[PDB]
Amino acid sequence: TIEKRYDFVFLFDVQDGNPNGDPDAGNLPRIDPQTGEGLVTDVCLKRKVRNFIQMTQNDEHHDIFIREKGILNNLIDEAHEQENVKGKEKGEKTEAARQYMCSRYYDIRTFGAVMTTGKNAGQVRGPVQLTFSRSIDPIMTLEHSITRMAVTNEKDASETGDNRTMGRKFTVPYGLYRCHGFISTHFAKQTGFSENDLELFWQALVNMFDHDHSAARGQMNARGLYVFEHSNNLGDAPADSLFKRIQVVKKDGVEVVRSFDDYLVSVDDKNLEETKLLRKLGG
Amino acid sequence: TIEKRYDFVFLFDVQDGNPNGDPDAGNLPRIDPQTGEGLVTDVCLKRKVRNFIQMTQNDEHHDIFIREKGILNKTEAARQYMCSRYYDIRTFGAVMTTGKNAGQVRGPVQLTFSRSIDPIMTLEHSITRMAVTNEKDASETGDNRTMGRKFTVPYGLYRCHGFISTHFAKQTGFSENDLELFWQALVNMFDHDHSAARGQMNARGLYVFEHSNNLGDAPADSLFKRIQVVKKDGVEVVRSFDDYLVSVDDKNLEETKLLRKLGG
Amino acid sequence: TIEKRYDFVFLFDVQDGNPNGDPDAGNLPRIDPQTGEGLVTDVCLKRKVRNFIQMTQNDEHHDIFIREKGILNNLIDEAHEQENVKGKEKGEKTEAARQYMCSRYYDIRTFGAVMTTGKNAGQVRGPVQLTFSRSIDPIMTLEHSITRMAVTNEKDASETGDNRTMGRKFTVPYGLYRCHGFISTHFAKQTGFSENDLELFWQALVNMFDHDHSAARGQMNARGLYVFEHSNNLGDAPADSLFKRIQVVKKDGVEVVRSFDDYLVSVDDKNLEETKLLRKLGG
Amino acid sequence: LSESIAAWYDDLQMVRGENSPYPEYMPLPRLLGNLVLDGKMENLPSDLIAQITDAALNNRVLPVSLLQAALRRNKAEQKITYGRASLLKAYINRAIRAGRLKNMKELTMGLDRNRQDIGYVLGRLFAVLEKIQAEANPGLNATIADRYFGSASSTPIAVFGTLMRLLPHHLNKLEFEGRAVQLQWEIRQILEHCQRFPNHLNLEQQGLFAIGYYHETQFLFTKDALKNLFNEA
Amino acid sequence: MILHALTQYYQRKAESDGGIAQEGFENKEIPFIIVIDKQGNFIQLEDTRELKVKKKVGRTFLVPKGLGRSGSKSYEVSNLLWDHYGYVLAYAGEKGQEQADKQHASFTAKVNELKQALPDDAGVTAVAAFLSSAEEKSKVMQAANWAECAKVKGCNLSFRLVDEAVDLVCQSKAVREYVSQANQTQSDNAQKGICLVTGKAAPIARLHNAVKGVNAKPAPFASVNLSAFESYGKEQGFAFPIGEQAMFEYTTALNTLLAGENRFRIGDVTTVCWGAKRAHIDAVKALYKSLYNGQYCKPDGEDKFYLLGLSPNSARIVVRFWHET
Amino acid sequence: GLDRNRQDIGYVLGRLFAVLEKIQAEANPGLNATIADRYFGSASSTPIAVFGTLMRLLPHHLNKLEFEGRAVQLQWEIRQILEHCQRFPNHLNLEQQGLFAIGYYHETQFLFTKDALKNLFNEA
Amino acid sequence: RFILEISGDLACFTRSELKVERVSYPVITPSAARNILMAILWKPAIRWKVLKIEILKPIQWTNIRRNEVGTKMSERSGSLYIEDNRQQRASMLLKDVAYRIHADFDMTSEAGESDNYVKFAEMFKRRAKKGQYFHQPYLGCREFPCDFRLLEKAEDGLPLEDITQDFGFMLYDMDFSKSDPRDSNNAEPMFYQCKAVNGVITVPP
C-alpha cells in the first residue's frame, strides 16, 4: 500500500489513425467542439492498460475482467462462492466481496467495476483516476474514406455489376495529447494498491499504445510521462500550479504540426524541490 | 475559536469532466437554462471538503459522521461532545435528534451555488460498452452491448462564495486550526478527489477577505463587484485560463480589511 | 504461435503511378491538404499482401478471400459447416469458428475479418496491425489525364462517328512513403500466427508491388524494411525511441526528390543492443 | 395561452420536399423521441423533452441544453430528417422576438436566399454537397455527411478544407452537364452570401447549420425547382 | 397553486357531472371481474380488456379508495370490497402462501364486519357468503380465462351480482351512504388544523394515497416515506399540513387525469394538460390523436391556468412543469 | 459578395483558381470535365504544383478562345486579382484553405454574372 | 417601516404542501423574510414582521434535483452512509431574484430593559448600510446569497406593472403562540393575498 500522492502528466502523440473513435460520428476522433482540439476518453486508456496487462501478466491476483466473450454476471455470481457464501450476512457482504475483488482483480484495484445493477458486490471509488487528454493546437482531421470490392450480406446494392460498399476509416496527421492522472492515498489504503501495482501501472502507461494496435487507431506512440510524488498524503501545491510548470508549445517557425520536432517543451525544476519528487519515465 | 469574519471567493475550473451533473435529465452538467452559465451546486464542494478532511486526518477529533460507503467502512454535553469529536459538526453546524432549536444548528461555514460567467457547452458523447450488466434484451449471442453516454465539459470556470462568521464558530468550535485545515482542503479538494466523470478540476483564485469586526464592516455586493472575472478581447469562447481575465480591487479594502490570496 | 512482439518500419518508393487513389476525390492519391504530404491507406498494403500471397501460395489451409465472384455469406456458411454445427453451443462455438477460420483463412490469421453480419462467429482481432503510410517531404502530385478512342455505350458517344469519352489517370511523380506495423503475442496465441506466417508476411513486405501490378498502380518498389524484435513480451522500449532512429530527410539543395539518392536516410543503431534485435530485411 | 401555441405551431412548418413519408405537422411524441440514443427509454426527460412545453407554449426562451442535445443527435445520426429540424427553429426567432440572443434576424418558412449569416449558408453548403454526392454515386452505404459531421457543426475549417477536393470529382462523376452546372450555380449563389469560414462555430450557429442543411436537402429533393431557379440566371 | 388549483378544478369538475369520484371513490383499472349470483356461487369470469396497442388491466371503474399496501405488513391494511388478486383466492404467483392467507382472512373479516354494520343490502350478503363458503374459490381457478390472470402483476379481482350488469357491487344504493359517512367520521377525528389549500379545519392527513399512472407500481405523491424530510420531527404526517379531504380530492384528480383523453406520453414521462374551462383547448390534449389536424385558431377564448407535469423517480413523484403564462 | 481588397493569400489563390476554371470552361464549348475536376485535390494543398501548370496552359486556352476583348478583360482581372499576392507558398493553413474555397466560389459567382466584369473594366 | 432590497443568485422557497419536492415560491415567502430579518439582526425583545412583498425580476424556473439521505443523525448510529438511503428529491430554483420587501418590527413580551424602538431602528439601519449581520441570509435555502441594501423608496425596475395572476394560498408564518422557547412542534397556516399589480400584500393576523 502506497503512502504518497501521485500526479502524472502523460504527453503522448498519435502519428496516424484515430486515438478515440466517436460512436456518434462513426469513428471520428472526439475533437472539442469549442476550438478543434482532440479529446481522448479515459476508458480507452483503461482498456489499453487492461490489454497490455493481459499481454504481459495474465496470472493470479491480477485479473482484467473480460469484454465481449463471456457475460459479466457469470463472474459476478461466481465471486460470491468464495469466502462469503452465507457466513457474512447481506448487511456487509458487499464490503467483503469488494475486498475479495480488490485482492483478486487488478483493474478494480487500479480503477473499478460496477456490479450494483442487480446484486451489490462492491463499489470502489477509484484510486488511480485519469481524465481526458487535450491538445495544444487544433488538430486537422484527415478523414480518409474507404470502399470494398464486394458485399457482406445481401444488401440492395448487390447487383450484377460491382457491389461497392463504402467505409469511413478516419485518420489523424499528427495529434499531441496531454492526459492528466491522479492517485491518492486513502483509496489505495482501502483497496491495497501496493508498489508492485504502481510499477505495473507505470510500465503500462510507458508502453501500451505499441502493444495494443488496430486498423482504426493506426499508429499511437508515447513521448513522456512527468510524475510528481508528494512527501506524504497532503497537498503542498494545487495541481494547476504543478502542471503548468512543465508546458509544451507550438514551434516559432511554423503553424501546422506533423511530428515531435514541431513542438517545444519547457520544464522548471527550481521551485519543485520543496517537498515533492519529480520523475520522468517516458522522456 | 476565531474572532474575525472571513468572506472568500473560490475560482475553480473543470478541464475534462463533469463538475456537477443534472440529476433531473440523465447526467448532463448543470447549466443555466437562460444565460447558459454553469450552475455548480455547493454539495459537491461539501463532499470534496469532507473527503479531504477524511484523507488528511484518518483519526479522531476530525471525523466525518456522514462518510461514504466506498471510502471507509445531557443536551449541551452531547452537543459539545459532537462538536469536539466530528469536524463536520463544527463545519456545517450540528443536527441531531435532540437539541435547543429543534436540534438544528446553521453553522459558520456556508458555501454558495457556483455560477459561471460564460456559457459553456456540455459535450454528450454517447459511448458504447462492449459488455452487458444484467440479462437485458441486448444480452444475446449477437453482441452483448450496453450503450451509454459520457458527459464532459471542455472548460468550465465557476466562482463559489463563502462566509465564515465567529458568532457561529463560538458555539460550534471552529478554531484557527480548523480554519487552516479548511483552507488547505479548499486548495486541494479537487486534486485529491477524481473519477472518470469528474475528470480534472483545478483551482484558480482563493480570494479571502478578513474583516476586523466580528460581524463584518463590508457588504457582500461590493466584495463581489470588486473581483471581476471576464473574457479577453479577441477571445471568442473559453478554453483555458489564458483566455480569461481576473481583476482585483485591493485599493479600497486596505482600510480595515485584510486580503489573502491562497490560490492566485 | 510466436512469442515475441515485432515492430517493422517499411519505406517504399512509388515512382510513376497511383498507390492509393482517393475514393470521394475521383481517383487522385490521398495527400495531406494541411502541408502537402502524401498518404497511403494500410488497407491498400493489406490488399497487396493478399494478392501476393494468392499469386504465391494457391494451396490448402491458406485462404485468400475471393473476389466479387462469390458472396461472403457463402464462405461463412462453408466455414460453419464443419465440426461445430449444432452440438457445440454458440457460446464457445463462436470461438471454435474463430479458431477454425484463423487456422484455415490466412487473411483472418494475419489481419482479420468480420463474421457477425448474417451468421455470427465471434469477434477476432489479429496480431498483425498496420498503420497509414506517411511521406517525409511534401509530395506534389501531377494529376494526369488520358483519352480513349472508343466509347462504352451509345449514350456516352457522339452524334455520328467521332467516338470519344476522354479519360483520367492520376499519377505520382515520386513518393517515398514510410509505414509502420506491429505483431503482438496475445492475439497471436489466440489466432495462430506462427513462424511460417511470419516468414510469409516478411516475404510479402519485401516483395508486394512486384506481384500485384496494375495499370494505375505504376512502378512501385520497396526500399527498406527494418524490424525491431524484443526478447520478451513486455515493453523493452517505446515506439518513439525506436522509430526516430530511422531518420529520413531531404538533401542539401534538392527541392524535389526523384530517386532514393536525394533522400538522406540514417539508421541510428548504437544504443539498442541491450535486449532488442534489429534486422534489415528489405534494406 | 393559445397565442403561444399558435406562435409555436406556425413556425413548425418546414419546407418539406416531395416524396416525404413525414407530414407537415409531426406529432410531438415522435419529435421528442427522435432525440434518444436508440429507443424510447434512455433520454433526458427534464431539461430537454420535458421542457418544450414550458419553453414554447408559455412564451419563453429555449435553454442551451436544447441546442447541445440537438447538435449531439445531429452528429450521432449524421443526418437531419423530419424529427430534429423542427426543434432548432425555436431558439432563434423565439429569442430575437424577446431579446436574449445577439443581433442577427429571424428565419422564414422557406429557403432564405440571403440572410448573410454563417451557419445557414454553411449548412446549405453541406447539404448541397451531400445531394451532389448522392446524385453522383447511386448506392451510397455512407455519405460525406457520415464522415464530416463530426466537425461540420463545430469547426467548419476542419471539414470544408478537405471536402472541396471531392466535390469537383463528384460533379464530374455525373452523367449530365446541365444538372452539374445547375448545382454549381446553386452552390455559388449559396456560398456568395457567406463571408469567411470561422475558426469555431459558436452556440448560435449549430441550430442555423442544421436548419440550413435540412432546408437545402428538402429543397433539392423536391422535383425540378433547381432547373427553374437556374433558368433565371 | 400546486395543490390548491388541483382541488379547485376537482370541485369544478365534480359539479359538471363528468364521471368523477364523490367522497371515498377512485377510478381504478379492473382487469378480470368475477361475476357471481345474489347469494354467492361463482358464475362467470368476465374481462373488459382490449383497449389500445397495449393490453391494459381492463377498463376503469369507480371503486372505494384504499390506504396503500406498500410496505412489509401489506396484510394489516384490510381494504373494503376490492384489493389485489391474492386478497380473495389467497393464491399468489411469485409470493407464495403464508402472506396470502392473512390477506384473505383480513378481507373476509372486513366484509363480515361491513355486513354486520349494514345488514339487508343484497350486495354485501354475496361477498360475505362467498369468502366464507370455502368451496367456490377452487372453482374460480378452474374457469375459462383464468390462465390469463396470473401472468401479469397488479391484477384486481372485483365482484358483481346478477340482475344488474351495469352496476358494480360497490355502486349500489346501499354502500355509498356508508362510504360517505366513513369519510366524514373516521377522517374527521384526528387533529384540528391547520389546513393548507383550504384554510379551514381539516385534520392532519397521514399516509397519502398512492398515485398510479407514472410508475409500474402505485406510489404516493407527497408523502415522507422516511425520516430526513420531516419538519420538526413529524414522523410522516404533520410535515405537510394538508387535510384528508383535499388530499383525497387531489389524489383522485391526478389518478383520473392520467388515463383518459388527457393522458399523453411526452417522453419517459406521463404529464397532463387541462385548462380552467370557464378543458376544450383542442391543441395540447390532442397530442397523438391522428396526424395533427388544423385546429389552432383565434376563438377569442384563451383560458388561463397552468400546466402541471408529474414524473416518476425512485419512490415518489417529481414536479417539473411549472409555468402559469 | 466578393472582397477584392482582402490582402490574403487564400482569397487571391481562390480567385485565381476560379478565373482559371472559368477560362477553361469558356475555351471549348462541348466538354466533359474542367481543370477543377482534376487538380482540386492539390490546388490549395500545393498551389505551386497546380496554379503554375494551370496558368502555363492558360495561353493555349486563350488561343483556343473566340473573342479577343473577353480575353483582354480576363487577363486584366487576373492581374488585378494577383496584385494582392506577392509569392506562392508551398504550405497553406486550414484557415487559408477555407479562405481559398470562399474566394474561389465568390469569384465564380461574380464571373458567371452577366453584366459585372465589363462594368468593372470600364473604370480601369 | 424598512425597505430591504433582497437579491442574490438563485432562490428555492420550499413550500409546505410539497416538502419532499422543494418547489420554489413565485415570490419571497413571508416566513423566509422573517428568518432573513432575524438572521440580519435579532434580540430576545424584537419581533420582525413582514408587511409588503414586492417583485423586481421575472420568474425563471430551473429544474434542479437534489440527492439527499433518508436518515437523521443521532447518538445511536455512528455513520449513516448516503449510498444506502439515497433519495433523488426535487428542488426547482428561481434564477435571478430580487425583492424590495417593506417590513418593520414590533415588541415582544420578554423584553425587560432593552425595549427601545429608535435604538433598534438605527442599529438595523447601520447594519444594512455597513454590512453587519449575525448570519448570511438565505433565499429559501442556505445556498444562495442575499445582497441586501437599505433603500429609501425605489431604486430598481419591476416587470409586473399590471395585473398578472394570484398565487393562491401562501405560507404566512408558523404559529409561535402555543410554543415554548426553542420550539419543536407547531403548525404551518396559509393565507390569501390580494391583487397582484406589483406584488402581494401580507395581512397581519
mmCIF file of C-alpha atoms in Angstrom, chain A residues 105-219:
data_model
loop_
_atom_site.group_PDB
_atom_site.id
_atom_site.type_symbol
_atom_site.label_atom_id
_atom_site.label_comp_id
_atom_site.label_asym_id
_atom_site.label_seq_id
_atom_site.Cartn_x
_atom_site.Cartn_y
_atom_site.Cartn_z
ATOM 1 C CA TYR A 105 -8.674 -8.134 -9.634
ATOM 2 C CA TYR A 106 -6.047 -5.663 -10.831
ATOM 3 C CA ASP A 107 -8.278 -3.360 -12.889
ATOM 4 C CA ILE A 108 -10.547 -2.976 -9.853
ATOM 5 C CA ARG A 109 -7.559 -2.035 -7.689
ATOM 6 C CA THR A 110 -6.418 0.462 -10.337
ATOM 7 C CA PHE A 111 -9.894 1.626 -11.401
ATOM 8 C CA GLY A 112 -13.001 -0.419 -10.567
ATOM 9 C CA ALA A 113 -16.107 -2.185 -11.811
ATOM 10 C CA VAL A 114 -19.859 -1.646 -11.467
ATOM 11 C CA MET A 115 -21.869 -4.557 -10.077
ATOM 12 C CA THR A 116 -24.813 -2.757 -8.401
ATOM 13 C CA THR A 117 -27.040 -3.458 -11.427
ATOM 14 C CA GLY A 118 -28.732 -6.290 -9.513
ATOM 15 C CA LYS A 119 -26.659 -7.769 -6.682
ATOM 16 C CA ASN A 120 -24.455 -5.318 -4.793
ATOM 17 C CA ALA A 121 -20.967 -6.837 -4.876
ATOM 18 C CA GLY A 122 -18.831 -3.743 -4.280
ATOM 19 C CA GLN A 123 -18.342 -0.092 -5.111
ATOM 20 C CA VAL A 124 -14.724 1.097 -5.218
ATOM 21 C CA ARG A 125 -14.372 4.845 -5.720
ATOM 22 C CA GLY A 126 -11.109 4.572 -7.658
ATOM 23 C CA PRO A 127 -7.588 5.441 -6.517
ATOM 24 C CA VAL A 128 -5.846 5.883 -9.868
ATOM 25 C CA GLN A 129 -8.063 8.154 -11.973
ATOM 26 C CA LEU A 130 -7.281 9.596 -15.406
ATOM 27 C CA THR A 131 -9.057 12.350 -17.329
ATOM 28 C CA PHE A 132 -9.429 13.289 -20.991
ATOM 29 C CA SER A 133 -6.320 14.256 -22.955
ATOM 30 C CA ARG A 134 -6.306 17.662 -24.651
ATOM 31 C CA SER A 135 -4.054 19.095 -27.349
ATOM 32 C CA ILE A 136 -2.198 22.392 -27.632
ATOM 33 C CA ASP A 137 -3.225 23.085 -31.233
ATOM 34 C CA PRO A 138 -6.481 22.255 -33.049
ATOM 35 C CA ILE A 139 -5.717 19.023 -34.896
ATOM 36 C CA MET A 140 -6.865 18.937 -38.530
ATOM 37 C CA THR A 141 -8.869 15.762 -39.117
ATOM 38 C CA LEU A 142 -7.931 13.996 -42.349
ATOM 39 C CA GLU A 143 -10.958 11.703 -42.839
ATOM 40 C CA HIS A 144 -9.885 9.107 -45.428
ATOM 41 C CA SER A 145 -12.898 7.097 -46.566
ATOM 42 C CA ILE A 146 -12.548 3.552 -47.910
ATOM 43 C CA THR A 147 -14.520 1.215 -50.163
ATOM 44 C CA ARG A 148 -14.926 -2.527 -50.691
ATOM 45 C CA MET A 149 -14.903 -4.611 -53.872
ATOM 46 C CA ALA A 150 -17.636 -6.904 -52.515
ATOM 47 C CA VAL A 151 -20.655 -7.101 -50.205
ATOM 48 C CA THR A 152 -21.038 -8.929 -46.893
ATOM 49 C CA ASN A 153 -24.714 -9.921 -46.760
ATOM 50 C CA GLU A 154 -27.444 -9.382 -49.377
ATOM 51 C CA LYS A 155 -27.968 -5.617 -49.424
ATOM 52 C CA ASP A 156 -29.876 -3.638 -52.049
ATOM 53 C CA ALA A 157 -26.601 -2.508 -53.668
ATOM 54 C CA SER A 158 -25.705 -6.116 -54.589
ATOM 55 C CA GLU A 159 -26.323 -6.053 -58.337
ATOM 56 C CA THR A 160 -24.636 -7.769 -61.286
ATOM 57 C CA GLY A 161 -22.090 -5.006 -61.918
ATOM 58 C CA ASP A 162 -19.947 -4.405 -58.834
ATOM 59 C CA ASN A 163 -21.197 -4.342 -55.239
ATOM 60 C CA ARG A 164 -19.383 -1.257 -53.906
ATOM 61 C CA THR A 165 -19.881 -0.980 -50.136
ATOM 62 C CA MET A 166 -18.053 2.057 -48.758
ATOM 63 C CA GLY A 167 -16.460 2.621 -45.354
ATOM 64 C CA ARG A 168 -15.346 5.547 -43.181
ATOM 65 C CA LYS A 169 -11.950 4.947 -41.533
ATOM 66 C CA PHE A 170 -10.667 8.370 -40.492
ATOM 67 C CA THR A 171 -7.075 9.146 -39.512
ATOM 68 C CA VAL A 172 -5.033 11.946 -37.939
ATOM 69 C CA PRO A 173 -1.866 13.514 -39.429
ATOM 70 C CA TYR A 174 -0.409 14.344 -36.009
ATOM 71 C CA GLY A 175 -2.004 14.648 -32.579
ATOM 72 C CA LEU A 176 -0.115 15.590 -29.406
ATOM 73 C CA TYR A 177 -2.339 14.735 -26.442
ATOM 74 C CA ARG A 178 -1.668 15.610 -22.795
ATOM 75 C CA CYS A 179 -3.553 13.469 -20.281
ATOM 76 C CA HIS A 180 -3.553 14.012 -16.517
ATOM 77 C CA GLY A 181 -3.958 11.402 -13.800
ATOM 78 C CA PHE A 182 -4.130 11.369 -10.019
ATOM 79 C CA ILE A 183 -3.525 8.670 -7.399
ATOM 80 C CA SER A 184 -4.479 9.476 -3.805
ATOM 81 C CA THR A 185 -3.709 7.537 -0.617
ATOM 82 C CA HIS A 186 -6.894 6.674 1.299
ATOM 83 C CA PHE A 187 -8.286 4.808 -1.714
ATOM 84 C CA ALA A 188 -5.046 2.836 -2.033
ATOM 85 C CA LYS A 189 -5.328 2.037 1.681
ATOM 86 C CA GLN A 190 -8.949 0.869 1.401
ATOM 87 C CA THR A 191 -8.108 -1.291 -1.647
ATOM 88 C CA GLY A 192 -4.473 -2.407 -1.462
ATOM 89 C CA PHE A 193 -2.613 -0.621 -4.261
ATOM 90 C CA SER A 194 0.931 -1.662 -3.360
ATOM 91 C CA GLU A 195 4.192 -0.640 -5.021
ATOM 92 C CA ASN A 196 4.065 -3.604 -7.416
ATOM 93 C CA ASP A 197 0.738 -2.463 -8.874
ATOM 94 C CA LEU A 198 2.099 1.092 -9.058
ATOM 95 C CA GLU A 199 5.147 -0.047 -11.038
ATOM 96 C CA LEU A 200 2.906 -2.160 -13.278
ATOM 97 C CA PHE A 201 0.699 0.865 -13.979
ATOM 98 C CA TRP A 202 3.795 2.966 -14.699
ATOM 99 C CA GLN A 203 5.099 0.373 -17.164
ATOM 100 C CA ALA A 204 1.641 0.218 -18.761
ATOM 101 C CA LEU A 205 1.494 3.994 -19.211
ATOM 102 C CA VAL A 206 5.030 3.854 -20.625
ATOM 103 C CA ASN A 207 4.140 1.120 -23.158
ATOM 104 C CA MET A 208 0.517 0.449 -24.127
ATOM 105 C CA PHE A 209 -0.048 2.201 -27.452
ATOM 106 C CA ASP A 210 2.545 -0.081 -29.066
ATOM 107 C CA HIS A 211 1.228 -3.382 -27.680
ATOM 108 C CA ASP A 212 -2.458 -2.656 -28.415
ATOM 109 C CA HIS A 213 -2.936 -1.709 -32.072
ATOM 110 C CA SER A 214 -5.684 -1.995 -34.676
ATOM 111 C CA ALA A 215 -6.730 -0.585 -38.051
ATOM 112 C CA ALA A 216 -8.732 2.421 -36.825
ATOM 113 C CA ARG A 217 -6.254 3.644 -34.198
ATOM 114 C CA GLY A 218 -3.402 3.458 -36.710
ATOM 115 C CA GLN A 219 -0.107 4.439 -35.084
#
